[PDB]
A paper describes a structure:
SARS-CoV-2 is a positive-strand RNA virus. Its replication is mediated by a multisubunit replication-and-transcription complex of viral nonstructural proteins (nsps). The core component of this complex is the catalytic subunit (nsp12) of an RNA-dependent RNA polymerase (RdRp). By itself, nsp12 has little activity and its functions require accessory factors, including nsp7 and nsp8 (14, 15), that increase RdRp template binding and processivity.
The structure of the template-RTP RdRp complex contains one nsp12, one nsp7, and one nsp8. The overall structure of the template-RTP RdRp complex is similar to the apo RdRp structure, with nsp12 in a closed conformation. The double-stranded RNA helix, formed by 11 base pairs from the template-primer RNA, is held by the finger-palm-thumb subdomains. Extensive protein-RNA interactions are observed between the template-primer RNA and nsp12, with a total of 41 residues from nsp12 directly participating in RNA binding (within 4.0 Å of RNA, 26 residues to the template strand and 15 residues to the primer strand). There are no contacts from nsp12 to any base pairs of the template-primer RNA, suggesting a sequence-independent binding of RNA by RdRp. Despite the presence of excess RTP in complex assembly, only a single RMP is assembled into the primer strand, as observed in the structure. The RMP position is at the center of the catalytic active site. In addition, RMP forms interactions with side chains from K545 and R555. Near the bound RMP are two magnesium ions and a pyrophosphate. The pyrophosphate is at the gate of the nucleotide entry channel to the active site and may block the entry of nucleotide triphosphate to the active side.
Residue numbers in the entry:
A (entry chain C): 2 to 64
B (entry chain B): 78 to 191
C (entry chain A): 31 to 50, 84 to 100, 118 to 895, 911 to 929
Write the structure that this text describes.
Amino acid sequence: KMSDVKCTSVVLLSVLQQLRVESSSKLWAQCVQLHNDILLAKDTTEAFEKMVSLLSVLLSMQG
Amino acid sequence: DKRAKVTSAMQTMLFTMLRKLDNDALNNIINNARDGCVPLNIIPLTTAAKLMVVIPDYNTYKNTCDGTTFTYASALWEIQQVVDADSKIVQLSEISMDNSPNLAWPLIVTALRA
Amino acid sequence: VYRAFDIYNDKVAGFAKFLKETIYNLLKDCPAVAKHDRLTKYTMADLVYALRHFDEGNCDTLKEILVTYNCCDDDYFNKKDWYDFVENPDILRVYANLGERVRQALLKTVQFCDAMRNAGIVGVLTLDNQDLNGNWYDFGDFIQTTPGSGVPVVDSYYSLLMPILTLTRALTAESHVDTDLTKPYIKWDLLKYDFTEERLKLFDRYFKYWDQTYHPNCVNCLDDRCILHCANFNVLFSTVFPPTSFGPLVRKIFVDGVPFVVSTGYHFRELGVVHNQDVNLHSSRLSFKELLVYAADPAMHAASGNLLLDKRTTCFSVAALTNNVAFQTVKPGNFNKDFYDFAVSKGFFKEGSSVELKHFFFAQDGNAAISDYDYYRYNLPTMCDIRQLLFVVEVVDKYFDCYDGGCINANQVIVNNLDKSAGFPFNKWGKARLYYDSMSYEDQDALFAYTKRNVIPTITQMNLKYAISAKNRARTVAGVSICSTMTNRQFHQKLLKSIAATRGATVVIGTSKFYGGWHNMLKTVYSDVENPHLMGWDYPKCDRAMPNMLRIMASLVLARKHTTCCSLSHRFYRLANECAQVLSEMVMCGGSLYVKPGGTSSGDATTAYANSVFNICQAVTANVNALLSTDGNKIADKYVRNLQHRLYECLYRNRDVDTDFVNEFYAYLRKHFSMMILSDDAVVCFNSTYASQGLVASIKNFKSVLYYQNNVFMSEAKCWTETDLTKGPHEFCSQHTMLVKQGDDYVYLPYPDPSRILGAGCFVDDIVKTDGTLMIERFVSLAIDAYPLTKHPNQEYADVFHLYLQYIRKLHDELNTSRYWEPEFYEAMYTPHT
RNA sequence: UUUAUAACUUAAUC
RNA sequence: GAUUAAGUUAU
Ligand SMILES: *P(=O)(O)OC[C@H]1O[C@@](C#N)(c2ccc3c(N)ncnn23)[C@H](O)[C@@H]1O
Ligand SMILES: [Mg+2]
Ligand SMILES: [Mg+2]
Ligand SMILES: [Zn+2]
Ligand SMILES: [Zn+2]
């Protein structure tokens, strides 16, 4: 479960990056924070919460 | 030849940078020195016409750039523009305690010597 | 109760904790003398021993000293890591409250030596005879002679006290008008750069009776030992003068009648003022060499830039070269789902497995580059115990006796890779290939000869790396100018090649781990220690926290092979160029120019070798301190007791180098404290009985040395000790060790963390590395690295190799000792016959 | 816009 | 068996 969450978070940050999210530093800082927190997590519940919080960013824009 | 191309590039850069130098401020600094030799660190400090301030948060802003004019390095500086980390123009009225979390940080303040 | 004493008898010498005349009339009028028929619980030796032998949880004397004199209060020590310079940087403020007491003690010592000189008394001053109020109270060992001709001996006192002068910032009051902290700071003229008279005044105020000549300008020094001696004093005095006076010194010059600004000298914190010898105010035309020199020179760039006030960092800003700040980010890594699906199919990553992913590409936002640069705030001006350092350098130099060196011609320099960055501003037009091709060998030789008579300052550029790790930290690399690199290769490459070509030595740079090399390295370090345990340590913040004294030391040890080709002025300008280029150069970080406080540079040609010198220096310091801090009366062995006595005598009583004792102490370390050193990594095989008796260094001694000399706290959590030599070292160069039966005999094989190899498989930093042609080669490399895992008892570890081989089969299908799809190809990589 | 060194692998060429 | 290129690892 957890490894899938980490691997999905990596590709999710990549797809956000290629959509030029990083040209808005205020949001890119939080995307990076969530990505690093997911990778550093050792429990899948906090990983899921932060993963869905991160995915909401992609869901907000047209994707 | 790459040799001549790089010679031309280096000499062009060296001569282009002189549009700012040889200002009479530089001569006033250098000539009164006992031996005509001065530290490099003081040259922009005493002779630069423009100052760039990079401010991480509002607490540093109130302590450094309150108002439209402020003092630094024994000179008075007047603010020309303020921009955020996204290089978008930020008006002086926007920079407040209540609005601060809405702004992107750091802020870059450019000022001209009075 | 135990108290610290500095002892030198005919029987015992050292500086350790021990269980505890009518000439007073000739000194009673001195106000630095205590009244004899008032004194405090602790002396100056207690403070010196507490800060030189720090141990947390065994530090109640330091706590009592700090709370007695209102540096802090009892509740300050309930904070976690109150003592740690990195986790609690406020501790420097707490120690700085002791500065006035130490400064008053120095002034009272100068008064006491004046009184002794007038009274005609001969005697040796010791720290344990001075109160923490600075009053001197012990006279029993002095000798009368003719009044007006007394001779106070103060070598040990000043030398032992020196590290605390910078830790407490004793000379802070000298920045104030009339040396009074209540009055405002002295305001200097911004154009004043010399300060030689101020340095001499400080020396005579505080070190009047220090017996050796001091040179405010190290260009007047006599050898490298004199350079170290005077640079150590310059470090202390430079804390008084304004920061804007340091760095390149500039002058107006005319070329074609057109005015340039060029650097004609440099003001060093450590080396004083250096002037260039080849300066000509009027020139008709500019050659390619002068074009290169003036393009590298920061004078033009700093003079043409805007003034910069960067509040994000505590470092000194010079100028902004661009109207806009740069906020470069770090991308996340790409995912190799093709390999991940294969791994999950074969049963990895199930819950409860001991093998799990932990190495990732960590993204970084726009603050990363400047946030990482700000860790230079851990670099602090550190004064060294100069007599101890001057002995250590002679012992450290013995580790480098077997290498050849000296200057070479430009036509025989070996440059590994020409298609890489030339640094700023040279990277604006070409790579290193361009400048190596454009310059003839005679132009390169004339540039090298010019740096033996003139200082060329250069600008280093800092760039973020893209690399896998288990840590969130962003890593930057320092790119140095081609102008500096080209001459540094011509100075150092012969010695670097000689080091990298040698086998069986202490420094193991250049030795391969393949084909039995790892086994040979372990059998070399195990050499003949007779109660062997293994030890390894870590330097916290090594690249940032390194004192400038030890970097200058490392540069001088590398330059000792230049006796026949270079004169002493040539060698001094080579050192001045090295300092101005890699120690305290200007850093291009995001389009803005900053002053680097100190520490190493990753892009410097000598970085790994200098770090090896530093690591050896710290280990020899730890051994010397362990030997001198032990109770000499309790040493059972006659030989080691005599060795301790001669060591103390050779540090603080002799000033000529005793080559026979350097030989004997080096032999002693080789016999009992044998080392394997690669950069900042180290494995030591040490005699356990001697370490338990305090005869050789342990982790405790490294902790103390790194506290008082490197300004860091080394926590034992990152250190290790192994008691069984059939086990390997626990951790060396990120490899573990296992004893493996291979053929008819057992060998040591290195093996990586399985998570590291799986991370290198799953994530890549470029999508093009998903192409089968490069992917197959990448997995061959990772299978060569992963192969020893099959010998591991943990079957979860063993399956990591078979996964890689199965994936190589799959890739080869999609597309015998040389056929890399079978295991015999990999087995051959770890057998002696290369 | 991505430094320095070291080792190893692979493919070329006389 | 000597250059050139690419890649991996370590520091
Ligand atoms: P190690 O424990 O990894 O770091 C200590 C020491 O190694 C360097 C050297 N030499 C180092 C590490 C990684 C790199 C890179 N990528 N490039 C250059 N140098 N290094 C540093 O000097 C550091 O202090
Ligand atoms: Mg380290
Ligand atoms: Mg390591
Ligand atoms: Zn000297
Ligand atoms: Zn030489």
